Design a protein around this ligand. Structure first.
Ligand code: NAD
Ligand code: NAD
Ligand code: UPG
Ligand code: UPG
Ligand code: NA
Ligand code: NA
Lengths: 338, 338
């Protein structure tokens, strides 16, 4: 199929693009490069074994969006573009609402104009809000995210829902991601954060590579097996795969298809640390710190639905998540070249 | 004060502007005229006894917004602009999200750019969602509105909240309106809907004036005193007044000040009908129809807070609401001139 992948040069999108090309789809990436570099493009092509067309631009640019859509005869759009730094969203709410909420509305408005009606949205587990019931099931009603970032995702999901209802021939997937980690097995593509990484894995990776002193473990008094926070880590390659599948199986299938993308199991901060130490051949340095603001103690996905309906499930392990990360981190300590 | 009133030429805004001028404030109205006419301007000036500067434009136009804000040295902004037809929002979700959500974000982004930090937002009771607890109190947590229109208001309230938190010197009032009705006592300004009116009052008014046959009463089996739906009707003049007060007393007072704007009492469809029959000197024709989709049986505001904190409360009665409406309807059956 002809697919436009916004945010295509970012973390999850690049991996997604590789898998997409591998499946012989025609890929058009649209990214504004606020959190990615042009240097990843050649890697995508290489690893994907096919050329993806790149367009520098902003989802907020309705007209451009509309033009692309038409120019490339797109059949479906995978929307990864946006801002996602939680803490920062607290400090800069407008930018999040603008990039994410207005960003998506401009994009879907362009889609409407161009007659495109198949969409895949990058959502988040946070939409479940403070749910005591874990694992989290798609049949649960959403709650209220604590950060503007989370709010923004929930808002988009709602907008998309209403849109579908009003334009019923639309096929829209709301992919609720849990905690993406890992890197392409080649060790030549992976997550490349700028500055202090906010997620656990990359932070650990930075400590291991000698860039950081110690990992601060946000709280050790949770009502968890080891007192550290528990999450549902999912390898970026599995995520990528789930995207291809969702795109291929839901294209032209009217409705709002919601699926939790996770391994369906939880792992502690300690569990992750240990896996990493093992992967990089040395004990990762860490210390206990106070709980982070708004942090939940533990949650993970119920991924039966995706299994059942899309025949999709994770195949990579936690060790692999760690190994792949270390490989990329270690082979390219400066990440993507400027 | 110097105040920018978006949506100033509309229903609630025009009345608000009159009251504002009467209090000697400098008013700049910004409206795109999608649901109002230039013909109301001269009426505002007349009734307000002072000239308000008018600017035709769209809140979505950040740059313009920013320019106005600066050009006019605005001190505070009253934001009434947006789309509000519930049913239509179900049918055209994008336009609502765009006008309301993106619309407000562009406006507050312009405010930020111009250094303006006092805002008043037109909110809705629907934000309380399906709350069994009535009357509705500001201390209640919000729920989930059933229409994109309602969702859009809730989204804005959230965005504004986050913004305030990140820019703490901002003063933002979230005015939750209940059911505005009525008209300026002069009978020369009032609500001028185009096409089939969606609210009860105007519809009744149209029946009375001979334009409509019968009023359809949406359901007569509610668990209410008379089986008809109950609401908190509030005279547009009271609403207007509450806006002036809120603006004058909250300007430069950091925080998110939320207030329910209602009379604090409920009235049935029948109650309203009867009041109107009385006002126009003839029985209003009506019939019982099935319940409307998503209609709640009864709700009204708890307005103690505004009383307590702003010393504000309604002064107009239901009869006056009816009388004023009929007066405007009857004196200007074609509404505002093209
Ligand atoms: N990474 C996670 O843990 C996590 C968890 C759940 C949800 N998500 C979501 O998944 C998506 C992808 O996340 P990611 O990890 O790849 O982050 P990322 O930063 O790597 O990917 C986002 C990309 O989109 C681009 N972009 C940002 N705003 C844009 C705009 N207005 N116009 C055009 N391009 C724009 C950035 O340049 C970047 O390449 C995001 O929408 C994110 O919110 C990620
Ligand atoms: N009327 C009600 O019962 C009710 C109940 C609760 C909330 N509200 C809200 O109160 C506000 C005022 O409502 P109203 O009854 O006066 O409606 P209205 O239609 O009379 O007022 C809205 C005005 O804003 C203008 N406008 C619309 N979109 C615009 C845009 N993008 N840029 C610039 N101007 C734009 C329209 O031309 C119109 O003059 C709205 O935000 C509405 O959602 C009204
Ligand atoms: O330096 C660090 C970083 C993380 N943690 C802990 O590690 C776990 C995971 O932290 P993080 O990677 O920040 O995961 P989450 O907090 O759960 O958030 C991610 O996963 C969510 C869905 O699960 C999405 O909403 C977000 O976009 C995404 O960043 C949590 O227990 C954190 O307490 C630490 O102890 N120290
Ligand atoms: O032709 C009609 C119109 C209305 N009604 C009834 O009259 C009452 C009020 O109807 P309406 O004016 O549509 O009031 P609401 O449905 O309560 O909605 C208004 O008030 C809300 C807050 O109270 C805001 O969210 C909306 O913007 C606003 O339009 C309800 O019981 C309706 O069932 C009828 O029976 N027939
Ligand atoms: Na429809
Ligand atoms: Na701050």
């Amino acid at each position: 199929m002809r697919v436009l992948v916004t945010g295509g040069s970012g973390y999850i999108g690049s991996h997604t693009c590789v898998q997409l090309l591998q499946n012989g789809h025609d890929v058009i990436i649209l990214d504004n490069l606020c959190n990615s570099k042009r240097s990843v493009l050649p890697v995508i092509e290489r690893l994907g074994g096919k050329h993806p067309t790149f367009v520098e631009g902003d989802i907020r640019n309705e007209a451009l969006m509309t033009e692309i859509l038409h120019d490339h005869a797109i059949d479906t759009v995978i929307h990864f573009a946006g801002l996602k730094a939680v803490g920062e969203s607290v400090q800069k709410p407008l930018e999040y609402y603008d990039n994410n909420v207005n960003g998506t509305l401009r994009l879907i408005s362009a889609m409407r104009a161009a007659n495109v009606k198949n969409f895949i949205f990058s959502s988040v587990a946070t939409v479940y809000g403070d749910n005591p019931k874990i694992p989290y099931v798609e049949s649960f009603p959403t709650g209220t995210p604590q950060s503007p970032y989370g709010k923004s995702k929930l808002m988009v999901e709602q907008i998309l829902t209403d849109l579908q209802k009003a334009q019923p021939d639309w096929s829209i997937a709301l992919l609720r991601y849990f905690n993406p980690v890992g890197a392409h097995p080649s060790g030549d593509m992976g997550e490349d954060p700028q500055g202090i990484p906010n997620n656990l894995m990359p932070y650990i990776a930075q400590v291991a590579v000698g860039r950081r002193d110690s990992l601060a473990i946000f709280g050790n008094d949770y009502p968890t097996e080891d007192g550290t926070g528990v999450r549902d880590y999912i390898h970026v390659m599995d995520l990528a795969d789930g995207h291809v599948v969702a795109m291929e199986k839901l294209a032209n299938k009217p409705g709002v298809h919601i699926y939790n993308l996770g391994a369906g199991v939880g792992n502690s901060v300690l569990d992750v640390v240990n896996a990493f130490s093992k992967a990089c051949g040395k004990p990762v340095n860490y210390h206990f710190a106070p709980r982070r603001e708004g942090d939940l103690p533990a949650y993970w996905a119920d991924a039966s639905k995706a299994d059942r309906e899309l025949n999709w499930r994770v195949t990579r392990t936690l060790d692999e998540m760690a190994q792949d990360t270390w490989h990329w981190q270690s082979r390219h300590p400066q990440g993507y070249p400027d």
